[PDB]
Structure formats: structure tokens, C-alpha cells
Subunit: 46 residues, 4 copies
């Protein structure tokens, strides 16, 4: 179903998306003055 090059591209964007979501939590915590426990509890609710 998925080629080796198509799965290679998806696996790159998945890891990249995972990293950006982590850093946003680090960035929002620093900026909004919150702990990473809360903001991730926020984004998981919605």
C-alpha cells in the first residue's frame, strides 16, 4: 500500500511533527508561565 519512499517521507514528517509539538510545549511554558503538565493536558482534552 505504502511505498518505501512514501513511508520514508511520512516517517520524516511524523518525527518532525513530534519534535515541533514538544518544543511548542517548552515554548508555551516559558512564555505563558505554565508547567508542561498543564499545556499538554490542555491539548489532549481538545
Amino acid at each position: 500500500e505504502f511505498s518505501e519512499e512514501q513511508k520514508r517521507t511520512l516517517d520524516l514528517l511524523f518525527l518532525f511533527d513530534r519534535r515541533m509539538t514538544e518544543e511548542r510545549r517548552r515554548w508555551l511554558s516559558q512564555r505563558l508561565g505554565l508547567n508542561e503538565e498543564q499545556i499538554e493536558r490542555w491539548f489532549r482534552r481538545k
Copy 2:
């Protein structure tokens, strides 16, 4: 938490949900698969 923080949070939730949709289109165009076929892969990658 502050009523100016749900601002920064509700925006980036709407911002990121819009980018996820558009990532799925761009991937459907660059790779050749449909969007369901892409959205299913990202989901099963958890």
C-alpha cells in the same frame, strides 16, 4: 489560568489543526495517496 492564555492556546490549537489538514493534502499531492490513506497512517503511528 489567565483569560489571555486561552487566547494563546485556542489560537495555536486552531492554527495547528489547520496545518495538519494542509499537511495531509500536500502529502496526498506529493506522494500520490489519498488523504484518508495518509490520515490513517499518521493515526496508527500514534
Copy 3:
């Protein structure tokens, strides 16, 4: 200076940052009620400042 399985990775994210910047502009116009030509050059004219 680079590689062939390192340039693709850089090429992919460049086309991806390219697409995400366009759509953001479209999404901001829809939301802030501005046009895409205002947005496009308010942004990255802030690297001017």
C-alpha cells in the same frame, strides 16, 4: 558539502515550510480579515526589524 540522502531531507522540509507559510497566510486572511498581500509582507518585513 552535503550528501544525497541529506539534501532530499532538506529539500522536503523546504517545500513543506513553503506550503505551511502559504496556508498560514490564507488562514490569517480568513481570520484577521486582511488580504494575503498585506500579511505576506508584514511577515518577513519584521526581519527588517
Copy 4:
């Protein structure tokens, strides 16, 4: 003026967000392609003025 305060308050936010994600993307690439943050940023500055 041309831009609203309630609009500029969104535009400023996403500029800092994008600027921060661009930093971390470079690092994430500098720690995955073996190259460095002046190599990676050079490549992106090159393709930017068309390649």
C-alpha cells in the same frame, strides 16, 4: 493604522512561534544529518533565494 491591535497581537505571536520552530528545526536537523546549525541554516538561506 492599517493593522489592528487585536490582529497584531496574533501576528506577533506567530512570528515568535515560527522563529522558535525554525531554530528547533535546525537543531533537530543538525542532530540528524550530522551537519551543523551554520551548515543547515546556510542551505536554507541558499534555497531561499531560489535554487
